Structure formats: structure tokens, C-alpha cells
Design a protein around this motif. Structure first.
Motif, PDB file in Angstrom:
ATOM      1  N   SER A   4       0.800  -1.222   0.000  1.00 31.50           N
ATOM      2  CA  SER A   4       0.000   0.000   0.000  1.00 31.50           C
ATOM      3  C   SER A   4       0.837   1.278   0.000  1.00 31.50           C
ATOM      4  O   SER A   4       0.344   2.347  -0.362  1.00 31.50           O
ATOM      5  N   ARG A   5       2.096   1.168   0.407  1.00 31.09           N
ATOM      6  CA  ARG A   5       2.975   2.327   0.452  1.00 31.09           C
ATOM      7  C   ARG A   5       4.234   2.109  -0.376  1.00 31.09           C
ATOM      8  O   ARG A   5       5.337   2.426   0.068  1.00 31.09           O
ATOM      9  N   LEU A   6       4.075   1.568  -1.579  1.00 21.77           N
ATOM     10  CA  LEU A   6       5.228   1.339  -2.440  1.00 21.77           C
ATOM     11  C   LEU A   6       4.924   0.609  -3.745  1.00 21.77           C
ATOM     12  O   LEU A   6       3.863   0.013  -3.912  1.00 21.77           O
ATOM     13  N   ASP A   7       5.882   0.678  -4.663  1.00 20.82           N
ATOM     14  CA  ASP A   7       5.777   0.049  -5.972  1.00 20.82           C
ATOM     15  C   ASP A   7       6.079  -1.428  -5.845  1.00 20.82           C
ATOM     16  O   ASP A   7       6.473  -1.892  -4.777  1.00 20.82           O
ATOM     17  N   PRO A   8       5.911  -2.169  -6.935  1.00 21.56           N
ATOM     18  CA  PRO A   8       6.212  -3.617  -6.887  1.00 21.56           C
ATOM     19  C   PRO A   8       7.684  -3.940  -6.688  1.00 21.56           C
ATOM     20  O   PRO A   8       8.012  -4.730  -5.793  1.00 21.56           O
ATOM     21  N   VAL A  13      10.866  -7.022  -2.403  1.00 23.73           N
ATOM     22  CA  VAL A  13      11.992  -7.248  -1.507  1.00 23.73           C
ATOM     23  C   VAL A  13      11.523  -7.492  -0.079  1.00 23.73           C
ATOM     24  O   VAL A  13      12.003  -8.421   0.576  1.00 23.73           O
ATOM     25  N   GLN A  14      10.595  -6.690   0.426  1.00 22.91           N
ATOM     26  CA  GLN A  14      10.120  -6.876   1.790  1.00 22.91           C
ATOM     27  C   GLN A  14       9.236  -8.106   1.920  1.00 22.91           C
ATOM     28  O   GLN A  14       9.271  -8.797   2.950  1.00 22.91           O
ATOM     29  N   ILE A  15       8.440  -8.390   0.892  1.00 29.85           N
ATOM     30  CA  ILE A  15       7.552  -9.536   0.960  1.00 29.85           C
ATOM     31  C   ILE A  15       8.355 -10.824   0.968  1.00 29.85           C
ATOM     32  O   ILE A  15       7.959 -11.800   1.604  1.00 29.85           O
ATOM     33  N   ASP A  16       9.510 -10.849   0.312  1.00 27.33           N
ATOM     34  CA  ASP A  16      10.329 -12.044   0.417  1.00 27.33           C
ATOM     35  C   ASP A  16      10.906 -12.263   1.809  1.00 27.33           C
ATOM     36  O   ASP A  16      11.014 -13.415   2.241  1.00 27.33           O
TER      37      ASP A  16
END
Lengths: 49, 49
Positions: A4-8, A13-16
Motif C-alpha cells: 500500500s505504500r510502495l511500488d512492486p 523485496v520486503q515480501i520475500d
């Protein structure tokens, strides 16, 4: 909120990192359930005898 | 394929992602074999009795 606060490119990187932590937790859980079930089986075997 | 379309400074980051995954998978294999061998051992101990 991560995305919600950033591009793909920047969110992947954070989702990994989130994925890595959450998969480690589940492996710890399953390995301990495997070790704890073999202890319950040795007890049910004593009960059958 | 990472050693053919990446320069050495960029292929380190991509090789480490494979190393981590393959190490995880090998170590999962080795844990589940310990847990399966501890069960074969009890069966053979009952057969010997």
C-alpha cells in the motif's frame, strides 16, 4: 501496508523477507509436532501391551 | 545461465539465493530421515524381541 505504500519492485523485496520468516516458523512447528507424535506413539504402544 | 548473462559482481547475489534454498532443502531431507530412522529402529527392536 507494505505494498500500500510502495511500488512492486520495492515491495517484492520486503515480501520475500516476510515469506522467509513465516516459512521458517511453520517448519519449526511441524518438526516439533513430528517429534512429539513419536513420543505419544510409544505411549499408546505401552498402553496396548 | 547466471554465469552467462551476469557479470561476477551481479551473479554472486543470484547464486546465493540458490545456495540458501538448496541448503534448506537438503537439511529438511536430512531431518526427516532421522525421524523416520528412529521409527524403523523401534520396529527392529520389537522384531528382535
Amino acid at each position: 501496508d507494505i505494498l500500500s505504500r510502495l511500488d512492486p519492485p520495492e515491495a517484492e523485496v520486503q515480501i520475500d523477507r516476510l515469506i522467509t520468516g513465516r516459512l521458517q516458523s511453520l517448519q519449526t512447528y511441524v518438526t516439533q509436532q513430528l517429534i512429539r507424535a513419536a513420543e505419544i506413539r510409544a505411549s499408546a504402544n505401552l498402553a496396548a501391551t
